[PDB]
Design a protein around this ligand. Structure first.
Ligand SMILES: [Cl-]
Ligand SMILES: [Mg+2]
Lengths: 250, 244, 241, 235, 243, 111, 195, 240, 231
């Protein structure tokens, strides 16, 4: 018995390719389109809620996830792989940072820790790479707003705006035309909805679209009052109603 | 059992070569070029970013050049994720030495240990090697300014000027042509950029597709300063040498 | 082609072992169905006892995981029982550690995460089963959550699983288009069971005796299975209408 | 590939059978047992004339009453000898006596099959273990990498083994003197050796009850070589 | 292909060919049966007399677990013994912790999970035995049959081995002709007959009959072997029926 | 607190001649001021013409004798039925006793 | 073990160490050298629990000698002292700690300066112009407070050391059988044979 | 832990992984060892395809194991560091327990034992390195020169070479080295070593390294100009 | 063919080829015979030599005062299994003050051999054993095979040409079973049985190996001049 697979399942081919990473990227390509846009006073991340069945309740399946009060994540590729990464990403934010410094990690460092986990699945014994690409939007005091992409290899890059998955090539072209360095948050949400309509085929409304922002602090979402320094989470998931309001003036 | 699926990463070919090491080097040869040039009064590190997109955040980015401690920096060529594993190990090894001896780590010692880790992955454990080549640029009070390189085989060597990654053959010929021993930092800066400008696969070399760093004794009296160049500072140095 | 033997990616980004585990799901040739009432959640499944020498009382693909949670499996019985025993242990441990009964959706997630590990780790094979968890959750109310070998899971208004799953699915879809609501607007669980059986009869096109069906019902604070006579009483009610 | 501890269709362990082929490539080693002592002799076989032949250590002491000669991948024998020496000394510590030659051989042979997926492969070396004890007297054992050992009156191992064994068959009798046995090892070694036999490329040793295990000098062996040549020319 | 070379590998069908190959080893083995009765269970087995040199009555194949459970199997005999040894450990720890002797359905799952565990990894081989077992507990009599896959069900009658189809047919008649139930002493006699009838599929070598039983009335709920006068009475009954 | 040792009393005596040797011991076994047995032997034939006694704490004495008897058995197995000499037996017993140097056998042993 | 002293002067470090090894009511030896050369320009004296002292000194000596071979370079006295301190700092929270106090006298060839480090068994390091371990300090520190000057020569340092030994021989209860004196300077380590 | 038996026997009785490790040694730069009457000299090739090198800081081919023993090698450079490190540790460990520095035979035997252990241990490949270990035993004036190889066999040599084109330089040494009369002086021994390398090297500029070891921990490395004088002298005598 | 790489793999017909190849090693081994009466049990073993200069490989091993076996196949594997038996016999004595039953001895060997046939990495034992013993239920003879299968018998034989001796014992069954209170006559029957497996070679003084255990007879082995009586 016992895990006898103590050897790497990802190796270099004669051409210098790491096969399993390339194939994991191919799995990401098949996945549903998701995107992220960075504004001056915020960040938006969005994706389509591909429903497996109309009997299925798509509210229960959350593609956009809170990692910390000021950091959110979205993906393209294999959903189960994403779910466990979010679990590990949330835990590592506490174990390797908050339990040491008494505060939540900045975006770049949490991203770094997630990347480390995805890199180890590329080199450790008896495991395949993760079949997902993550887009992580976040805010912290000293770096401000930021947006990062994380690939199956464990590589990560900062972006002003980008898209991943099914129609990423067309979506990235669309974002290049519309993006400027003076964009307000509302303008970035508007562009995100425009960009996402291109890749979506069926219904396009608040129930088929999942969208969240990293913006101003939300004292109403904190859950308590009495500590002036604690002003609430910057991560907010837009409601089904809030999306439909912006679709009328589209 | 599981024997069926084992690639056997740590074996010899009939010719006496390590398959995985050779293939890891083939991987590195497609990565963005990184150049190191050592002058008498400092060291230059230059590196070309891999095909940049216009919407990539350039100012708050780190792909090629990493800081190990206050006196030592590295230029990366290969898998970034792999490099970051090794960098955090190197950063820790430097602080262990400082904690033990109350002295900053000698450059060669740090390089040797990092290279010994890579060696281990080629001889035992059955795992794939790290697909990374480093250029180490650093200073200590024994040997002064030093340039090293290490590769997936775990073999390291010292250099006056060296390139890793893509087009090293062409880059090494150009460095071998124009380099001389009495060279200054400002001259080495110009050489590093001119070399990348000719060996680049891009149409024209611009500020947004470069990372740059110097290690001078240009601070105040007998002390070393690390300067990781900002985007605007790369833009200015590129105009000053007459490339753009 | 060893990329089809273990759980690693193929050139086109696929896990063939996971896909083949999905095909093992229908090896038993049984169809299951789940629907929600106002106060309850009902699950029904076909019961086929081919051998005359079998003790029919021991032939079952419905499991009582905890007092509140019930689970039906589509797939071979060894893997079904493997999953059942684990779910029972997980639900019990949850109660001990956190001081309250494990919710249906949380157990579904936990089992899904376990299923995900088998798709990523090489030495463990996936289980060739689809787990449908049902309860009346104290926060979310009537709940149906379903897990598969890929590690995917989601909540459902209603659902069906098996060889003729698609026929049952569309039958239920067309009802919820008509009723304009997320559930079976019915007071007693007895009539929700009658609804479940009736719509399975319409979708599959077969008639059922008392020994051809297997029924599980989730109410507030308990999940229970129906005996042959409880089902027979239910079949009589449908026939007389 | 295939498992290390796999059986062939004929009912033999592949790796054990392959290690036996490695031993056939090794240099010749001969042992002869008499009532006056046991003699051990080996072919040194220097790969080049620049190699200092006296550093070739293919006959080895285990204890004062037990000697050992080797043939095959001789590097593999180091850990076997180390184990044998420890086993012999350890037994003397626990029981205040010399250890039986058979018991020592058995202890060495227990290492042989401790391989698989313990060490990664069988030993690529065969051993001739010669010794004396009070119970069974002068003894010679052949210890293989299969874990098996046979006692022998006389035995040859290595490249010229089958040719030398046939010669030992005819020449051995139960009334051989030690001097006769010394010459017989030299005689048979000279027959199977590639290069011409002398004191520098061949080594003799013996074990007697009185003097224990002794490796002969190059001066002593040279006289026995000269004595051998004269006796063959004399008829 | 190559899907049958390694255990725990799904074929494109959704099948584990290695487990199906273990079933072939079971089909190759001698016949064994189990009969559920009014207040207990009866087990019987075919023992092939390879030679005159075999000591009669001294190569016992039926095994006891705890004091109330009987186990018999067909296929690779050593694999069956390994499974019973585990069963005994499982039953011992149950009694240790919970005081009461292990219930039969509880015991059935302990074997089932253990056998199923040997289809989850390529580092282990599936069991080469189908195991018929059962006994008497607080809820009454139970008979079970467990297969290489880990699959088990409750049974009114069970059979496995080379003469399984012959025995199954004969078992099906007993279920039909006795709906109200079969007695313990009757089931011993029927068990003998069914082994003798199932021996027609293995008739080169003559055989030795071996029967055991648990019964609430006859054996007081404990597992015992059928021997002496009661055994010879069952043999004579079986001899009379074949002629 | 639990005391793992006890004193079972008695006394033993060994004398050696030219071609013989005796090992004597009384048959009484005691704890405190009570008699446990009037006939409980503590001088044993261990095989190979070796007699042994371990007097003091009887539990430790019985354990040691039992271990030495077993040591003799395995000496035969591992060394071709060779007779265990009295000097070899003595050295073997030293290792048995010293093996528990930091949790001793509370016995005075004679062979 | 008992008396170990150290004096740093202008151009050298002087270490004095007692020769007596006592156990019970018997002086077993009267010529014991309580020091090891760690490197050509670094000397360590030691005193404390029997066995521990030598075992620790030799263990440190082996490690420093290993470093010297590996890098083909002598470690600075500051670097050696920090290594030693860390070893004692680990030791104190071990199952059985090294009960050893040390003085590390060295000449830094890069700075061209003598250096004296005092480290106790807890891992308490201090650089000093003069140092001592055990009861010796209770006499020598006050004496050196008075007579020591920073710009003294090696010969002046030896007379200053003679003044300490005389005071200890007068007021210490135990006979420590005189001292072995060693000098550490730019030219390395040498022993004063007539003291 | 990774357990795979990488070094195993083949039908013909060969351990291919050990034999392929010898091929890595054959690829490596040439190294030569010649022992005289009162000295040993270790010569080493350095390939000249590498210009713009920094010879101050580049790892030297000959390594000191202790103050009285040296180790040169041929084969994989990264592998050699691991053997050298282990050997250096064992050298200090021997001084610590035996209160005496290692003999050259003992140090060789240790290194050879390490190499052997990697030929029958699970999860590891053999060292792609052969070594020449040279020096003088403590309080002894008899020169010692030993060789090791991946298999684990070791032996003493009057003179020996390893690495690429080693069979050419071994041919040279076999006729030019006299057993009855070895190089009487340091100059004679160094010259014979340089001569032997000049059969293979290319140019006698910054391609040859020479290290001389003498009794009582007297080891010194020759500079470029010092070596170049031997090269200039040999070539002038050759033209005859 | 494709299903004989390791012991963890079944063939399409349900066979374990590695176990069958281990079984083949026994057939290559030298012949040995076992037989018993009601009072005594006897092992007779034909020993094999490498050549005339070599010794004859010892086939019979003692496990306890009342039990022992003969081997056929890989001798080191017999040493491992006999050592395990020695420990189990000894455990029974030290802990329970009880001589280990010959039946339990077999059960333990079966279970030890089985574990090697179901796990990756390991291999089956390459040896067959004939265990004799006298316990509380009289004389016993067992036949061990490395598949795990253990069988209690009146008489049997294993090794090369063992079918000759096995046929003889099958004929002689009624005669030798009633040789009670007569060691020499039971051995004679065993020596005559092993003679039916001889070809070209005959039983010599240093070739034959006999062992016996019984009611008032500890397990003892006879070699050399002690077996000259029975030639
Ligand atoms: Cl989880
Ligand atoms: Mg202090």
């Amino acid at each position: 018995m016992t895990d006898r697979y103590s050897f790497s399942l990802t190796t270099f081919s004669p051409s210098g390719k790491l096969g399993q990473i390339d194939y994991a990227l191919t799995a990401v390509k098949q996945g549903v389109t998701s995107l992220g846009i960075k504004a001056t006073n915020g960040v938006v991340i969005a994706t389509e809620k591909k429903s497996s069945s109309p009997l299925a309740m798509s509210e229960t399946l959350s593609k956009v996830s809170l990692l910390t009060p000021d950091i959110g994540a979205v993906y393209s590729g294999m959903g189960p792989d994403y779910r466990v990464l979010v679990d590990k990403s949330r835990k590592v934010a506490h174990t390797s940072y908050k339990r040491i410094y008494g505060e939540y990690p900045p975006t770049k460092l949490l991203v770094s820790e997630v990347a480390k986990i995805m890199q180890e699945a590329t080199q450790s014994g008896g495991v395949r790479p993760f079949g997902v690409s993550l887009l992580i939007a976040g805010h912290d005091e000293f770096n401000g707003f930021s947006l990062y992409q994380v690939d199956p290899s464990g590589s990560y890059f900062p972006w002003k705006a980008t898209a991943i998955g099914k129609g990423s090539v067309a979506a990235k072209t669309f974002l290049e035309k519309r993006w400027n360095d003076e964009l307000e948050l509302e303008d970035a949400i508007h562009i995100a909805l425009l960009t996402l309509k291109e890749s979506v085929e069926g219904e396009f409304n608040g129930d088929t679209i999942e969208l969240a922002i990293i913006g101003d602090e939300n004292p109403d979402l904190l859950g308590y009052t009495g500590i002036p320094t604690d002003k609430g989470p910057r991560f907010r998931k837009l409601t089904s109603q809030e999306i439909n309001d912006r679709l009328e003036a589209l | 059992g599981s024997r069926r699926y084992d690639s056997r990463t740590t074996i010899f070919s009939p010719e006496g070569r390590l398959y995985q090491v050779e293939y890891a080097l083939e991987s590195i040869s497609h990565a963005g070029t990184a150049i190191g040039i050592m002058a008498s009064d400092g060291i230059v590190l230059a590196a070309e970013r891999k095909v940049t997109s216009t919407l990539l955040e350039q100012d708050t980015s780190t792909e090629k050049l990493y800081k190990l401690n206050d006196k030592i920096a590295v230029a990366v060529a290969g898998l970034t994720a792999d490099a970051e594993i090794l960098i955090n190990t190197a950063r820790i090894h430097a602080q262990n030495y400082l904690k033990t001896y109350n002295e900053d780590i000698p450059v060669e010692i740090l390089v040797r240990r990092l290279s010994d880790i890579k060696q281990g992955y080629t001889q035992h454990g059955g795992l794939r090697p790290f697909g990374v080549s480093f250029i180490y640029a650093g200073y200590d009070d024994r040997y002064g300014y030093q340039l090293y390189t290490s590769n997936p085989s775990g073999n390291y060597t010292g250099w006056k000027a060296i390139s890793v990654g893509a087009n090293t053959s062409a880059a090494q010929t150009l460095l071998q042509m124009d380099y001389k021993d009495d060279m200054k930092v400002d001259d080495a800066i110009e050489l590093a950029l001119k070399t990348l400008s000719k060996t680049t696969d891009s149409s024209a070399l611009t500020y947004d597709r470069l990372e740059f760093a110097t290690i001078r004794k240009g601070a105040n009296d007998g002390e070393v300063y690390q300067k990781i160049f900002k985007p605007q500072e790369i833009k200015d140095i590129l105009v000053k040498t007459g490339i753009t | 082609g060893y990329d089809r033997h273990i759980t690693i990616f193929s050139p086109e980004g696929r896990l063939y072992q996971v896909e083949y585990a999905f095909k093992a799901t229908n090896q038993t040739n049984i169809n299951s169905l789940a629907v929600r009432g106002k106060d309850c959640t009902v699950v029904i499944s076909q019961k086929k006892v081919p051998d005359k020498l079998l003790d029919p009382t021991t032939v079952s693909y419905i499991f009582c995981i905890s007092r509140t949670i019930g689970m039906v499996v589509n797939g071979p019985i060894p893997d079904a029982r493997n999953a059942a025993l684990r779910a029972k242990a997980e639900a019990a441990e949850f109660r001990y550690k956190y001081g309250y009964d494990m919710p249906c959706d949380v157990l579904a997630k936990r089992m899904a995460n376990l299923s995900q590990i088998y798709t990523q780790r090489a030495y463990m094979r996936p289980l060739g089963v689809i787990l449908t968890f049902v309860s009346v959750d104290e926060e979310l109310g009537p709940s149906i959550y379903k897990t598969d070998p890929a590690g995917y899971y989601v909540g459902y208004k209603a659902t069906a699983t098996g060889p003729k799953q698609q026929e049952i699915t569309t039958n239920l879809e067309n009802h919820f288009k008509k009723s304009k609501i997320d559930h079976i607007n019915e007071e007693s669980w007895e009539k929700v069971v009658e609804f479940a059986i009736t719509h399975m009869i319409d979708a599959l096109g077969t008639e059922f005796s008392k020994n051809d069906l297997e029924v599980g019902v989730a109410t507030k604070d308990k999940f229970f299975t129906l005996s042959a006579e409880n089902i027979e009483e239910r079949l009589v009610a449908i026939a007389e209408q | 590939d295939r498992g290390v501890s796999t059986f062939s269709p004929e009912g033999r362990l592949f790796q054990v059978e392959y290690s036996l082929e490695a031993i056939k490539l090794g240099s010749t080693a001969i042992g002869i047992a008499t009532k006056e002592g046991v003699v051990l002799g080996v072919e040194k076989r220097a790969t080049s004339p620049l190699l200092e032949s006296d550093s070739i250590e293919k006959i080895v002491e285990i204890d004062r009453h037990i000697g050992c000669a080797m043939s095959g991948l001789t590097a593999d024998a180091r850990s076997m000898i180390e184990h044998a020496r420890t086993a012999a000394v350890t037994h003397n510590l626990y029981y205040d006596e010399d250890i039986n030659v058979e018991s020592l051989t058995q202890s060495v042979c227990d290492l042989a099959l401790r391989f698989g997926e313990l060490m990664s492969r069988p030993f690529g070396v065969a051993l001739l273990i010669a010794g004396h004890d009070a119970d069974d007297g002068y003894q010679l054992f052949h210890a293989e990498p299969s874990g098996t050992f046979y006692r022998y009156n006389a035995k040859a191992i290595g490249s010229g083994s089958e040719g030398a064994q046939a010669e030992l068959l005819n020449e051995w009798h139960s009334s051989l003197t030690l001097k006769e046995a010394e010459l017989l090892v030299l005689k048979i070694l000279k027959q199977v050796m590639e290069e011409k036999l002398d004191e520098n490329n061949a080594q003799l040793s013996c074990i007697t009850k009185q003097d224990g295990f002794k490796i002969y000098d190059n001066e002593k062996t040279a006289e026995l070589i000269k004595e051998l040549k004269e006796k063959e020319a004399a008829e | 292909t190559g899907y049958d070379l390694s255990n725990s590998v799904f074929s494109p069908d959704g099948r584990n060919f290695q487990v199906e190959y273990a079933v072939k080893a079971v089909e190759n083995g001698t016949t064994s049966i189990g009969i559920k009765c009014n207040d207990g269970v009866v087990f019987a087995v075919e023992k092939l007399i390879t030679s005159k040199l075999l000591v009669p009555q001294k190569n016992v194949k039926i095994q006891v677990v705890d004091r109330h459970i009987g186990c018999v199997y067909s296929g690779l005999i050593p694999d069956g013994r390994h499974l019973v040894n585990r069963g005994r450990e499982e039953a011992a720890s149950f009694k240790k912790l919970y005081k009461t002797p292990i219930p039969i359905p509880a015991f059935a799952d302990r074997l089932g999970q253990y056998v199923q565990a040997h289809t989850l990894y390529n580092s282990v081989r599936p069991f080469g035995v189908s195991t018929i077992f059962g006994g008497v507990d607080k809820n009454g009599a139970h008979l079970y049959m467990l297969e290489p896959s880990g699959s088990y069900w409750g049974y009114k009658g069970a059979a496995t081995g080379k003469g399984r189809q012959s025995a199954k047919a004969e078992l099906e008649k007993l279920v039909d002709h006795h709906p109200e139930g079969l007695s313990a002493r009757e089931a011993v006699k029927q068990a003998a007959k069914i082994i003798y009838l199932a021996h027609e599929d293995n008739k080169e070598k003559d055989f030795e009959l071996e029967i055991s039983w648990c019964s609430l009335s006859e054996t007081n709920g404990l597992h015992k072997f059928v021997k002496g006068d009661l055994l010879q009475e069952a043999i004579d009954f079986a001899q009379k029926e074949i002629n | 607190q639990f005391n793992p040792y006890g004193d079972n009393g008695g006394t033993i005596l060994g004398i050696a001649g030219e071609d013989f040797a005796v090992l004597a011991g009384d048959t009484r076994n005691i704890t405190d001021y009570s008699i446990n047995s009037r006939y409980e032997p503590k001088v044993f034939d261990c095989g190979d013409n070796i007699v042994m006694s371990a007097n003091g704490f009887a539990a430790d004495g019985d354990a040691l004798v039992k271990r030495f008897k077993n040591s003799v058995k395995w000496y035969h197995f591992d060394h071709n039925d060779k007779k265990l000499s009295i000097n070899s037996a003595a050295r073997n017993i030293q290792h048995l006793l010293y093996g528990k140097r930091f949790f001793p056998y509370y016995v005075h042993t004679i062979i | 073990m008992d008396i170990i002293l150290g004096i740093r002067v202008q151009d050298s470090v002087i270490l004095a160490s007692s020769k007596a090894v006592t156990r019970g009511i018997s002086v077993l030896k009267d010529s014991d050298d309580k020091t090891r050369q760690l490197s050509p320009h670094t000397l360590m004296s030691f005193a404390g629990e029997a066995g521990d002292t030598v075992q620790f000194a030799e263990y440190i000596q082996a490690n420093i000698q290993l470093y010297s071979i590996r890098e083909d370079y002598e470690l600075s006295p500051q670097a050696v002292s920090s290594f030693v301190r860390q070893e004692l700092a680990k030791s104190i929270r071990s199952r059985r700690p090294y009960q050893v106090n040390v003085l590390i006298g060295g000449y830094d060839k890069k700075k061209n300066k003598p250096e004296l480090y005092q480290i106790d068994y807890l891992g308490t390091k201090v650089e000093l112009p003069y140092g001592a371990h055990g009861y010796s300090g209770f006499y020598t520190f006050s004496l050196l407070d008075h007579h020591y000057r920073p710009d003294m020569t090696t010969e002046e340092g030896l007379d200053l050391l003679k003044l300490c030994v005389q005071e200890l021989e007068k007021r210490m209860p135990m006979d420590f059988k005189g001292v072995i004196v060693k000098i550490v300077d730019k030219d390395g380590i040498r022993q004063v044979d007539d003291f | 832990g990774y357990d795979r038996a990488l070094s195993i026997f083949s039908p013909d009785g060969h351990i291919f992984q050990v034999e392929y490790a010898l091929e890595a040694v054959k690829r490596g730069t040439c190294a030569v060892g010649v022992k005289g009457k009162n000295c040993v000299v270790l010569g080493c090739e350095r390939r000249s395809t590498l210009k713009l090198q920094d010879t101050r800081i580049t790892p030297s081919k000959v390594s000191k194991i202790d103050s009285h023993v040296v180790l040169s090698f041929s084969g994989l450079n990264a592998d050699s560091r691991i053997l050298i490190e282990k050997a250096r540790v064992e050298a200090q460990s021997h001084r610590l327990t035996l209160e005496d520095p290692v003999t050259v035979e003992y140090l060789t035997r240790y290194v050879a034992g390490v190499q052997q252990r990697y030929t029958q241990s699970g999860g590891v490949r053999p060292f792609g390195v052969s070594t020449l270990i040279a020096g003088f035993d403590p309080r002894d004036d008899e020169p010692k020169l030993y060789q090791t190889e991946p298999s684990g066999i070791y032996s003493s040599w009057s003179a020996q070479t390893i690495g690429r084109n080693s069979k050419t330089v071994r041919e040279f040494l076999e006729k030019n080295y006299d057993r009855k009369e070895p190089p009487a002086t340091v100059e004679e021994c160094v010259k014979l070593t340089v001569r032997s390398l000049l059969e293979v090297v290319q140019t006698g500029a910054k391609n040859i390294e020479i290290t001389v070891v003498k009794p009582d921990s007297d080891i010194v490395a020759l500079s470029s100009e010092e070596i170049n004088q031997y090269v200039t002298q040999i070539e002038q005598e050759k033209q005859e | 063919n494709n299903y004989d790489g390791d012991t963890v793999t079944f063939s399409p017909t349900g066979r374990l080829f590695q176990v069958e190849y281990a079984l083949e090693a026994i057939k290559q081994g030298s012949v040995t015979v076992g037989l018993r009466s009601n009072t005594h049990a006897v092992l007779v073993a034909l020993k094999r030599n490498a050549d005339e200069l070599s010794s004859y490989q010892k086939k019979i091993i003692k496990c306890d005062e009342h039990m022992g076996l003969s081997l056929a196949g890989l001798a080191p594997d017999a040493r491992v299994l006999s050592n395990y038996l020695r420990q189990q016999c000894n455990y029974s004595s030290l802990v329970f003050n009880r001589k280990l039953a010959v039946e339990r001895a077999g059960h333990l060997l079966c279970d030890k051999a089985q574990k090697n046939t179901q796990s990756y990495g390991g291999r089956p034992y390459g040896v067959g054993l004939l265990i004799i013993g006298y316990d509380k239920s009289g004389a016993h003879l067992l036949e061990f095979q490395p598949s795990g299968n253990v069988t209690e018998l009146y008489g049997t034989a294993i090794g090369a040409r063992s079918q000759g001796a096995k046929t003889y014992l099958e004929r002689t069954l009624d005669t030798f079973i009633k040789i009670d209170g007569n060691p020499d006559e039971l051995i004679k029957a065993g020596v005559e049985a092993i003679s039916q497996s001889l070809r070209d070679e005959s039983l010599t003084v240093d070739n034959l190996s006999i062992a016996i255990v019984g009611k008032d007879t500890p397990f003892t082995i006879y070699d050399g001049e002690a077996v000259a009586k029975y030639i």
